[PDB]
Design a binder for this molecule. Structure first.
Ligand SMILES: NC(=O)c1ccc[n+]([C@@H]2O[C@H](COP(=O)([O-])OP(=O)(O)OC[C@H]3O[C@@H](n4cnc5c(N)ncnc54)[C@H](O)[C@@H]3O)[C@@H](O)[C@H]2O)c1
Ligand SMILES: NC(=O)c1ccc[n+]([C@@H]2O[C@H](COP(=O)([O-])OP(=O)(O)OC[C@H]3O[C@@H](n4cnc5c(N)ncnc54)[C@H](O)[C@@H]3O)[C@@H](O)[C@H]2O)c1
Ligand SMILES: NC(=O)c1ccc[n+]([C@@H]2O[C@H](COP(=O)([O-])OP(=O)(O)OC[C@H]3O[C@@H](n4cnc5c(N)ncnc54)[C@H](O)[C@@H]3O)[C@@H](O)[C@H]2O)c1
Ligand SMILES: NC(=O)c1ccc[n+]([C@@H]2O[C@H](COP(=O)([O-])OP(=O)(O)OC[C@H]3O[C@@H](n4cnc5c(N)ncnc54)[C@H](O)[C@@H]3O)[C@@H](O)[C@H]2O)c1
Ligand SMILES: O[C@H]1[C@H](O)[C@@H](O)[C@H](O)[C@@H](O)[C@H]1O
Lengths: 339, 339, 339, 339
């Protein structure tokens, strides 16, 4: 039997999740939608040929007793309240990142979900589902390179829109690494420091520093060095290297396109779209959520606790962006509810 | 509508197709299976959690009116009779390659299908659906390397089962390249020659020559040199290089796993089976079949005609296997039914 | 103590050898030169600031008692006579390839050398000294991939000059693979066959077929497939893959230049010059010869007998070029003098 | 003419330089040696078949008027006094790194050299002669990736001797990157900071932190992140990546050895010896020195001023090692003498 889904927020990513649920993946149907732009909601039903109700708001959607799960894909600042409303129902909840735009909001969601008899929230950190990143983590966990001492990573994007701010370097971009590293390493963060190399001439946006260097430390002492470079021009690329006691692991060459020998060069195309880079991870992530719902079991993907960790770390990083000083992080031990 | 599927042959690939139809793809349910090994059939039903009938043979399964489409996934030599029996029904038919193991068998199938009012057979030539191979073809077709003069290909398997015969080097293995190159180049064959290099000590099957070299020539004069090496030990690999007038195109190494630096080496894993190497291609081809069946429309993928055309060249190769002499090929034009 | 060298032929490669001997390598001095173009010879003296005598011909140069070794770097057709004269002296002899332009010439040399008390000839087949090619042979010889069954190789050149003939595809280009493969495999050839794929539109030379496919068979059964492509446009490239019973070996990409990420591509440069490609090999080869002469020991590089094997094989290939048919090769057993 | 050389310090590197000068490179002869271990010097003479005088100390050796140049290859701490003595002579001076073990000693040398009628000192920072590193610099200097924003580098070593100390992570290992980067970027340093990640279990030496992270900043604002890992086990490796405004450049994998397909992996060998890694650079660096001396021209390699920059920066690094705090660097303008 089919997992009946409501979607709250039918913009870009909302529509892409609808497409996933409707066209790409198995076992679900979108039967309700809402958007504060009623017209956007109506277009979704129309464009994807859904047999679905358009609700005027989130509150009314959430009272529909036939909806098994909700996807929250509205503006980030709007997640917190909506998630708290859905927690007054029994529905499963897939929220895109962030769990909340403040760490205070995140803690509320955590505290409330912790009052429930079982976990219902999955947060949209898709990196964990990417085949390559997953395969590296698995290899690391065999012990073949010993303990992880240093991690070096890059988050490379070709160009940004007019609306991209200095803070979004953290909240939209580094956030992926923020969720990824503690999971990768099975460790907790103790600090974050953002430093600014010389400013790129390619930056067109007021207040945006690019590139940015993020250094994180963990409780076991692993140091993580992330390069964030969002006006890099050449392509979209995610790089990851783990330095171990006895060896190293890194992500392979990405891409399926051919190797061209021509005009005194050998070359391969580089991905230009993060959308395309992570198509697989999005599919895998959402299919897993649906599969869990379908058997009336809690999600096994990133949780509200993960969302809270990310929120705390992002806020520490936003603080660090002001003065380039190291900010400490102390995250509480995970409630057993979240293991 | 959800397509109700029967699967005939529930070995390695039968199982993989059941898995994908059940857990990954959309719009299908496996409702019946059969295998000459009843235990294998029962194992498939249980391992994939099916509510499926287990029929004692193909003929009984084919006479179940509730089945919309059948998958023929038995030993290659068994496809011919099963496909012919299925053509006595109104079911859609997906057969794995080869269409048959002889030219005469393939021709029987085409002759019978031509008596029907619409086309119902798709053949599992999945290479055409592989994203990398498609990307190479599309780049070739831009003209960037000029005309294709030579193609070099490898079809590498680590080992074979005890039932793998010399003839199967062509009908089970080379058949992929036989179909592929004529699609890739939009050209047809004028000859094939099989030669036998130094026999590997790794061969364990009586009568099997390994490796084998296949030289195919096309009408436009492109020469294709295929290496078939099915006891290679190291891994499963498909390699493709197109030599043009002004450049070259090559398929990249396939791999998701990490690069490991350890013990005086830098290494990456190689796939050990088709099952994972071509998972995308199998998913795509099968989804397309199911989507067509759902509309009660003929398949748009490779046809029994493509199967026959390949069988002509395969039969030529099997003839060449006897004396290592070149065998001429001149295939008939595509009948209107198959255009 | 310094090996005194005379150079016979002071053209492009003659000058390059002079340069090596004078400015790059250790233990030698060019004290005499000759060229049928006297002006070229004088120029070589001035240009390399030599303390050397210019002789009118090879005969007179060869009478200088102070010369320990001669370099034969004239037109290929001139090698035979000069090498035969030099064998009337006790001097060591480095001849560039070919040993002789006919097989009968090569045999005359071998027969004459066999009367001497020690071996004095090294032939300039430099591939054997290329570090990459050597490293591959070495790894092969460890047994790690088992016995070599098939060799796939490419000799890629961007364009040719107007003097380049069909037969030069063998005598100037394939000759390197002809010397290389029997050495690589510790084997003897039994046949060669040249075939012509579709003719490239890039060919501008009368009578030239390009590309050419060369297939060689060996006594142990290994099949060698070489692609010769001399109007390839994109670069100069030497490729080598050995298919073994239990694994494969291939040369890596040549070049030390950086990997560039730019403009939606990842790229490395491709060499356009065979000269640049084989700088190291030429240096290593000549240094070895000099080092042997310095000890008054026989050269240990490719011998007149290797020159003979090359000549017989090349002749067979030029024969095959007429009709694309296989031509047998039965090389006599190696004389103990050459073992 | 032949450059007559004296060598001070005939240990591992001094013997390696003697070997270069005698058996590999052109244009030099070792005619004098000294070592505080007299038996080591005598042994160098025997082992390399030198026609050389053994002197009991540096002072005595420096009085041989037949010596055109001296090589200083003693303990680092002995370089300063010896170089200063040598500057009272007219001989040219090749000193292995470091110029001096204190910045004050380096200044003394600089100050003294500045009084002379020509520059005579070259310092053994061989990285600048490495073909791959040079090719990367050259490409960077074309402007193709825009301005350099960040540099990421690794200095990876398998294991260290029992006498390797924490400070040697800087003075023996990071010193190479210290000289390299300011040259690479044509910039000057403004700061250095050494941080200590998780301590490796592979460390056997009391007080040694491994790995170590070094962050250098430059006047133009480029940030350099170096990973120093000297108990890495797997191999010896130098990595370099330059992140530009519009692209990236990175050094390719080192090695000419083959790609092996075997045992479910594709692999290439990793160098285990620093010696073999930089053999080319050592040869080139020394040949260039000898070629300059042959002409009575000043060296064009790394100078005493480069030695001073390195000593200042190393000193700052050793200071940073105490508390992991950033240390400023402000080197004086380069004297015209050293331009
Ligand atoms: N990689 C990822 O995981 C990833 C990628 C893209 C976007 N996202 C996240 O998805 C969310 C949406 O991003 P987007 O790119 O689609 O933005 P968007 O602006 O296109 O779409 C958001 C939609 O939400 C609607 N909306 C806003 N507030 C609402 C409310 N309270 N209730 C209902 N609807 C509301 C808007 O009208 C709009 O239609 C954001 O949280 C974004 O961070 C995540
Ligand atoms: N397209 C591809 O890449 C790909 C990959 C693997 C296999 N195949 C094809 O799939 C088919 C099956 O191969 P496999 O690897 O699964 O082999 P397998 O040996 O694992 O399984 C074959 C199954 O067929 C059963 N069988 C044999 N004859 C039968 C008959 N008359 N009726 C019913 N069942 C019968 C056997 O008992 C066995 O269970 C072959 O045609 C093979 O060429 C294609
Ligand atoms: N091993 C290699 O890779 C390689 C590379 C280049 C050339 N070669 C060989 O080197 C030889 C010379 O080639 P090149 O490119 O220098 O050609 P070139 O034409 O530049 O020079 C040849 C020189 O030989 C002189 N010469 C001709 N006949 C002579 C004779 N009887 N005595 C003395 N001098 C004579 C010519 O006047 C000319 O100066 C050829 O055999 C060529 O095949 C080998
Ligand atoms: N550039 C490079 O990459 C590189 C590599 C290795 C060594 N080096 C440098 O080479 C120098 C030597 O290192 P090594 O590995 O050969 O060490 P080593 O200990 O093997 O040899 C040093 C030699 O110097 C002798 N010696 C010590 N003090 C002396 C003095 N006052 N006068 C004369 N001789 C003296 C010692 O007896 C010994 O024989 C060091 O400065 C080292 O840092 C540079
Ligand atoms: O049946 C399989 C299948 O066709 C594979 O794709 C091929 O690689 C194997 O050689 C063959 O035995």
């Amino acid at each position: 039997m089919v997992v009946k889904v409501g979607v709250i927020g039918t913009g870009a990513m909302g529509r892409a999740h609808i497409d996933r649920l409707t066209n790409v993946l198995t076992g679900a149907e979108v039967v309700a939608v809402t958007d504060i732009d009623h017209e956007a909601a109506e277009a979704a039903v129309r464009d994807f040929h859904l047999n679905a109700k358009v609700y005027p708001d989130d509150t009314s959607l959430l009272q529909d007793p036939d909806i098994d799960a909700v996807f929250v894909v509205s503006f980030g600042g709007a997640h917190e309240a909506t998630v708290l409303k859905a927690l007054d129902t029994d529905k499963f909840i897939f929220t895109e990142k962030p769990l909340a735009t403040t760490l205070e909001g995140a803690k509320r969601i955590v505290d409330k979900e912790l009052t429930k008899s079982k976990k219902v929230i999955q947060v949209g950190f898709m990196r964990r589902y990417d085949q390559g990143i997953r395969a590296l983590k698995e290899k690391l966990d065999t012990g073949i390179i010993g303990a992880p001492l240093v991690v070096r990573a890059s988050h490379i994007n070709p160009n940004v829109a007019s609306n991209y701010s200095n803070e979004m370097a953290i909240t939209d971009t580094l956030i992926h690494e923020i969720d990824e590293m503690h999971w990768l390493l099975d460790d907790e963060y103790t600090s974050i420091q953002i430093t600014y190399p010389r400013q790129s001439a390619e930056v067109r946006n007021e207040g945006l520093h690019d590139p940015q260097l993020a250094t994180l430390t963990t409780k076991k002492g692993t140091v993580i060095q992330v390069l964030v470079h969002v006006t890099a021009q050449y392509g979209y690329e995610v790089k990851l290297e783990v330095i171990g006691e006895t060896g190293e692991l890194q992500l392979p060459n990405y891409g399926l396109g051919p190797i061209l020998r021509s005009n005194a060069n050998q070359q391969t195309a580089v991905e230009m779209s993060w959308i395309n880079r992570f198509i697989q991870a999005y599919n895998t992530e959402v299919q897993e959520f649906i599969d869990e719902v379908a058997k009336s079991e809690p999600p096994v993907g990133p949780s509200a606790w993960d969302g809270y960790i990310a929120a705390i770390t992002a806020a520490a990083a936003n603080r660090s962006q002001k003065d380039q000083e190291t900010v400490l992080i102390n995250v509480a031990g995970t409630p057993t509810f979240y293991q």
